[PDB]
């Protein structure tokens, strides 16, 4: 795995910001794309764009074969058994809302529980809050251990015979924790519940095999895994999708439409109403080909190396707190003592470094952490240890800078 040759494929990395080489450490907010994906979108619009299915003309057939070809690439990439289980959506958030509307609101009654965790992103909280309110069910939270991991004993305790859905992140976008999803799915299934996995932050960075995880649903976003914006996938086991009703209705997802009643197409098209995200899905297929050629296990190994390096170097800084466990995915969320993280991010961008500040769409977790906001640097296959050095040197300088302005200000008054 040669990071020079990989970085050469991403045109956006090669520019300056504020007079310094760009150091992009915000891939958990969104990833950058390689020429193979951008040129796949260009070839689509320059050569074979047309609407898909009912192919009667040559371009239509090429676009349809491109779109359904990318569906098979996704199926193989997450090792689903069938294309019927792969639905294209606009992103993880819409995929999780479809499960909450079509599966939860059909299957919850008073007394039933949906169980989630305090580290969930909003997209894997709010649809369940609304689904339990619609149905009179109960929402419950699995508690976290002090390092931000989940114990399977707390899972066993929280999940009961009244639990119908457990919904949990594969990897946290704030703590970097990799949750024990395969063992959580066994506990859910032992209690008669399904498990819904939010895979937005695991899919780009490590191999996913839905048959080994035995998850009932799994959701992911293209824009975090070198693919186009505006596209995602919902995987669900075929026997559950077959019994769920559509979340949206219109052309392409019907078989017969009468004045008052309609019948639906087979899977997966039952869940894809209207003209689909044709270019984006073909571009996500190209992103998967690109990542597979590098190797997801190679990419996870490089991120293990960068995360171990970063946590060591952050422990060299005084006055910095990092949240979450030592064993983790490729990201570090932190705060500097006495500097607001938005000001940390502002000053780092003046040195060319892009990180994110705020609650990262996880307000209940920030409350658990007893902070109002954090800064996060996150890594992917095109980042290097030299970029981590630049980050830790800039945080040192930021600390000294805010120390010096404070000392100066205090002496002034």
Ligand X SMILES: Cc1ncc(COP(=O)(O)O)c(/C=N/[C@H](CS)C(=O)O)c1O
Nearer to its own copies, 177 or 222 (CB): 222
Q: Is residue 107 a contact point for its own copies (CB under 8 A)?
A: no
Q: Which of its own copies, ligand X, none sits in contact with 130, Cβ below 5 to 8 A by type?
A: its own copies
Q: Is residue 36 a contact point for ligand X (CB under 6 A)?
A: no
CB neighbours of 400 closer than 8 A, spacing ≥ 6? none
Nearer to ligand X, 73 or 121 (CB): 121
Q: Measured between alpha carbons, how far is 159 from 191 in angstroms, rounded to an integer?
A: 7
In DSSP terms, which residues pair with 375 in a beta bridge? Answer: 334, 357
In DSSP terms, which residues pair with 113 in a beta bridge? Answer: 138, 163
Q: Is 7 exposed, middle or buried (0-12, 13-18, 19+ CB in 10 A)?
A: middle
Two tokens, residue 265:
């197409």
Nearer to ligand X, 159 or 225 (CB): 225
CB neighbours of 333 closer than 8 A, spacing ≥ 6? 174, 175, 176, 322, 323, 324, 360, 374, 375, 376
Q: Is residue 223 a contact point for its own copies (CB under 8 A)?
A: yes
Q: Is residue 93 a contact point for ligand X (CB under 6 A)?
A: yes
Among the residue ranges 18-26, 188-196, 328-336, 399-407, the one whose residues contact its own copies (CB under 8 A): 18-26
Residues of this chain, 232-271, that bind ligand X according to CB under 6 A: 251
Total residues at interface with its own copies (CB under 8 A): 88
Other beta carbons less than 10 A from residue 191's beta carbon: 17
Q: Measured between alpha carbons, how far is 271 from 279 in angstroms, rounded to an integer?
A: 18
Residue 332 has φ and ψ, to the nearest 5°, of: -140, 120
Q: Measured between alpha carbons, how far is 81 from 113 in angstroms, rounded to an integer?
A: 29
Q: Is residue 48 a contact point for its own copies (CB under 8 A)?
A: yes
Residues of this chain, 359-398, that bind its own copies according to CB under 8 A: 361, 363-364
Nearer to its own copies, 29 or 317 (CB): 29
Q: Which one of residues 174, 178, 279, 391 is an interface residue with its own copies (CB under 8 A)? A: 279
Q: Which one of residues 168, 200, 329, 366 is an interface residue with ligand X (CB under 6 A)? A: 200
Residues of this chain, 287-326, that bind its own copies according to CB under 8 A: none
Q: Measured between alpha carbons, how far is 393 from 314 in angstroms, rounded to an integer?
A: 10
Q: Is residue 349 a contact point for its own copies (CB under 8 A)?
A: yes
Region of 230 on the Ramachandran plot (φ > 0 left; ψ -120 to 50 alpha; else beta): left
Q: Is residue 113 a contact point for its own copies (CB under 8 A)?
A: no
Q: Which one of residues 27, 89, 173, 333 is an interface residue with ligand X (CB under 6 A)? A: 173
Q: Is residue 275 a contact point for its own copies (CB under 8 A)?
A: yes
Minimum gap (Å) between residue 166 Cβ and its own copies: 16
Nearer to ligand X, 34 or 176 (CB): 176
Q: Is residue 359 a contact point for ligand X (CB under 6 A)?
A: no
Q: Is residue 201 a contact point for ligand X (CB under 6 A)?
A: yes
What is the CA angle 358-363-369, rounded to 5? Answer: 85
Q: Is residue 196 a contact point for ligand X (CB under 6 A)?
A: no
Q: Is residue 108 a contact point for its own copies (CB under 8 A)?
A: no
What is the SS3 assignment for 248? coil
Q: Please pick, among 22, 361, 371, 373, the residue that the annotation labels catalytic.
A: 361
Q: Which of ligand X, its own copies, none sits in contact with 309, Cβ below 5 to 8 A by type?
A: none
Q: How far is CA 222 from each of CA 30, 200, 239, 299, rounded to the nearest angstrom?
A: 9, 9, 25, 17
Q: Is residue 272 a contact point for ligand X (CB under 6 A)?
A: no
Q: Measured between alpha carbons, how far is 236 from 222 in angstroms, rounded to an integer?
A: 17
Q: Is residue 198 a contact point for ligand X (CB under 6 A)?
A: yes
Active site residue 215: no
Region of 111 on the Ramachandran plot (φ > 0 left; ψ -120 to 50 alpha; else beta): left
Q: Which of its own copies, ligand X, none sits in contact with 215, Cβ below 5 to 8 A by type?
A: none
CB neighbours of 237 closer than 8 A, spacing ≥ 6? 85, 216, 217
Residues of this chain, 53-92, that bind ligand X according to CB under 6 A: 91-92
For the four alpha carbons of 371, 94, 76 and 180, in that order, the dihedral sign comes to positive
Residues of this chain, 308-347, that bind ligand X according to CB under 6 A: none
Residues of this chain, 129-188, that bind its own copies according to CB under 8 A: 129-130, 139, 141
- The contact set with ligand X (CB under 6 A) reads 28-29, 51, 91-93, 121, 123-124, 169, 173, 198, 200-201, 221, 223-224, 251, 274-275, 356, 360-361
Give the catalytic positions in this structure: 361
């Amino acid at each position: 795995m040669n990071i020079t040759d990989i970085r050469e494929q991403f045109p956006i990395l090669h520019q300056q910001v504020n007079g310094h080489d760009l150091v992009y450490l915000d891939s958990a907010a969104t990833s950058q794309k390689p020429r193979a994906v951008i040129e796949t979108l260009d070839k689509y619009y320059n050569q074979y764009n047309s609407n898909v299915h009912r192919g009667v003309h040559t371009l239509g057939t090429r676009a349809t074969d491109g779109y359904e070809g990318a569906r098979e690439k996704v199926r193989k990439f997450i090792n689903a058994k069938s294309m019927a289980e792969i639905i294209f959506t606009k992103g993880t958030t819409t995929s999780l809302n479809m499960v909450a509307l079509s599966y939860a609101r059909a299957n919850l009654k008073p007394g039933d529980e949906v169980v989630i965790t305090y580290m969930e992103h909003h997209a894997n909280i709010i649809p369940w809050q609304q689904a339990v309110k619609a149905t009179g069910a109960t929402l419950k939270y699995i508690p976290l251990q002090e390092d931000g991991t989940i114990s399977l004993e707390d899972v066993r305790e929280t999940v009961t015979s009244n639990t119908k859905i457990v919904a949990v992140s594969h990897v946290s976008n704030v703590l970097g924790t990799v949750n024990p999803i395969k063992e959580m799915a066994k506990i859910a299934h032992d209690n008669g519940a399904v498990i819904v996995v939010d895979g937005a932050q695991s899919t780009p960075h490590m191999k996913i095999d839905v048959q080994d995880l035995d998850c009932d649903f799994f959701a992911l976003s293209s824009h975090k895994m070198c693919g186009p914006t505006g596209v995602g996938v919902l995987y669900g086991k075929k026997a559950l999708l077959e019994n769920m009703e559509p979340a949206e209705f219109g052309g392409e997802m019907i078989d017969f439409v009468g004045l008052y009643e309609s019948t639906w197409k087979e899977l997966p098209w039952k869940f894809e109403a209207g003209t689909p995200i044709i270019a984006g899905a073909i571009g996500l297929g190209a992103a998967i080909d690109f990542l597979e050629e590098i190797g997801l296990d190679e990419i996870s190994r490089h991120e293990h190396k960068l995360a171990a390096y970063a946590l060591e170097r952050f422990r060299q800084l005084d006055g910095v707190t990092v949240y979450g466990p030592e064993e983790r995915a490729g990201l570090v969320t932190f705060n500097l003592d006495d500097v607001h993280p938005h000001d940390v991010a502002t000053v780092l961008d003046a040195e060319g470094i892009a990180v994110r500040a705020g609650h990262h769409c996880a307000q209940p977790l920030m409350k658990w952490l007893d902070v109002t906001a954090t800064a996060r640097a996150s890594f992917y296959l095109y980042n290097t240890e030299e970029e981590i050095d630049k980050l830790v040197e800039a945080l040192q300088k930021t600390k000294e800078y805010f120390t010096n302005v404070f000392v100066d200000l205090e002496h002034h008054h």
